[PDB]
Amino acid sequence: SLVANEEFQHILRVQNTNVDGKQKIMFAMTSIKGIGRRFANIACKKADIDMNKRAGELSAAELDSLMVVVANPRQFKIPDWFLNRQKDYKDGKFSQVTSNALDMKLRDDLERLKKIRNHRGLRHYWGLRVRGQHTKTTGRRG
Amino acid sequence: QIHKIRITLSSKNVKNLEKVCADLVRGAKDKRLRVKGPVRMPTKVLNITTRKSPCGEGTNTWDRFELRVHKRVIDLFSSADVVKQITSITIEPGVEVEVTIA
Amino acid sequence: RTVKDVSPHEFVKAYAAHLKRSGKMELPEWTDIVKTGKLKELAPYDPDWYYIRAASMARKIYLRGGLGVGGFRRIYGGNQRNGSRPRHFCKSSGSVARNILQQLQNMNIVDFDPKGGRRITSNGQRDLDQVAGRIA
Amino acid sequence: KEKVNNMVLFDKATYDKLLSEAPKYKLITPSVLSDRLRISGSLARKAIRDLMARGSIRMVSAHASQQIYTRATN
Amino acid sequence: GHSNIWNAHPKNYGPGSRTCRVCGNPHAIIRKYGLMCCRQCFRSNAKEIGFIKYR
Amino acid sequence: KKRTFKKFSYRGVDLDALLDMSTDELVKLFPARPRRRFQRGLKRKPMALIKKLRKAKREAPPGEKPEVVRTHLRNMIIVPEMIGSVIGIYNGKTFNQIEVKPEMISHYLAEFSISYKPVKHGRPGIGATHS
RNA sequence: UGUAUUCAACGAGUUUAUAGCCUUGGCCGACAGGCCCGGGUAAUCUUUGAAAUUUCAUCGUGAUGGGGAUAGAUCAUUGCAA
Ligand SMILES: [K+]
Ligand SMILES: [Mg+2]
Ligand SMILES: [Mg+2]
Ligand SMILES: [Mg+2]
Ligand SMILES: [Mg+2]
Ligand SMILES: [Zn+2]
């Protein structure tokens, strides 16, 4: 088993993201935006993938299983508190957004804040800190 | 008509507290009573560290103020009347005497 | 030969294996999703972490018979990193400890101490002693 | 500088090279195997375990932060 | 002022709810052991209170 | 009928349902901070402010915006009932004018009346450097 | 990083009102937290009271499982108000 199989893949694609084949599956999946070590770990656990294998060792069907697990956390008993999009503003649904969907959600939040002239939105627009930090001495880049 | 009378003595002066304890012990002994103690509890050291300056100028220098409280415990096996008579002896200022049962 | 005469690590491994083989433990559904404490960054690496924790807790109760959930939270706590701020002690998960204590009680390994906490039963003493004896 | 392109899984040539020469090394450690066979530390540890299973090497001393291994026979 | 307005702001906590028992200043109050004295007043009255400097 | 490209919704609830929804059910859709604020109970001043806003809306001529209701309550939380109201919010110096929109519910009135003037930097003065 | 393992000292703690301070124990909860019996005005109860470290695994020279700045969503506690 120590010898690489002929099917070993050095580079694989998932949601238009390059995934390193040499990295372990748990930490290889983290290259996708919106997926971290905790979420990747639980997704691998729920998909029955063996955590000791590399990203390139597995088969494509296992990547599809991982993606369905990620896209339907509720179906696999992943709790609501474990998701990065809880109680959505418009739909009010709980889901794990990833890749360009995460950027779309972030842009929607920022533009919604800016449209109503909310203070946080104005701070975002001006390029200043939004979480109350002092700005006299730190955060100097331009 | 025999009870374990508990006597607690607290003071800031070691000499007066020790003298009062010795006087109580000798008084109890003179009556052929059984005396257990005096037991010296760990000294309580109240500590306050405050800046010397009444303002913010100069080297930050600090005063270490301590107030030491010494506590003693004495147990007597006798009736209430005899212990009350014994404790009636003169007690110098700064020594607090409390008498209880068990 | 008793538990005190064997290495704690080897005894913990042996007793975790024994507990798993027993089949009386009822692991909660969240064992594979929760961390062991707020101070942790990732879930336990070992898939058998629940049985190992139960064995360690049983050994602790065997050595001392007055521990409660808070005591076990302190025992399995540790430093918590705070990014750019210094580290401070942090307690571990209390739900895991409560569930493990209840499961161990269900197996007659420990019971409720009259003074509070949990105490090792005679059956628990016998089981741990036999496991330690078989380690050699 | 140039990054080291260590392999996480053996190829047949490197696996045969391991099985041939590794049992003849005076000192065997995961770092030594990683530097010689040009393999990752994890693959080096797995290869050391495999060689120990085969009986071609022996354990001089085992520690979590340091594993020292040597040829079974001179 | 009007009863419901004059001095109506709650003062159940914070520096504004405590003052030095000696001078009434609200700053640098020593609350340890119930002294409730400002640091200056406490440093002035320490010897009378019974606090001694040993080191 | 009218066709709206982006119909307003809050947690999957349309605008019309929000108005008819009671406070108990409406709070569950709000985030943690407004939920805690409502559970603790609003004081007399917010109730008076909502009553005044109601009165201003009632007296508004049809097809016209309500009059200005000015208040110092910068910590008031916007509820769906206040949508469409015209409120003057004190910032410590002046009552800033805003109109309540559906997207501003569950926010504080302070968030729409900036208390400071944004900084525009002039040339550094004497003593800025050589420290 | 994840387990297993186990060695301090200086100190501080209540108006008892259903209860105010330090809080054990039990129950609920992933956590944050919540509820219920209670102890302590104290060498009496919290206090059976730390981490670095030790130990075994994963990681493998890759700004990488180093680093945690910045930011989004959401949940609790303090407080009249976050
Ligand atoms: K700045
Ligand atoms: Mg990622
Ligand atoms: Mg200890
Ligand atoms: Mg990194
Ligand atoms: Mg890190
Ligand atoms: Zn004063």
PDB file of C-alpha atoms and ligand atoms in Angstrom, chain E residues 20 22-25 38 41, ligand 6:
ATOM      1  CA  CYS E  20     -14.260  58.134  49.747  1.00  0.00           C
ATOM      2  CA  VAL E  22     -13.061  60.503  54.391  1.00  0.00           C
ATOM      3  CA  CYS E  23     -13.064  63.114  51.609  1.00  0.00           C
ATOM      4  CA  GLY E  24     -15.917  62.071  49.302  1.00  0.00           C
ATOM      5  CA  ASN E  25     -13.757  61.915  46.181  1.00  0.00           C
ATOM      6  CA  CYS E  38      -9.333  56.836  48.505  1.00  0.00           C
ATOM      7  CA  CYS E  41      -6.790  59.339  52.445  1.00  0.00           C
TER       8      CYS E  41
HETATM    9 ZN    ZN H   6     -10.197  60.422  50.403  1.00  0.00          ZN
END
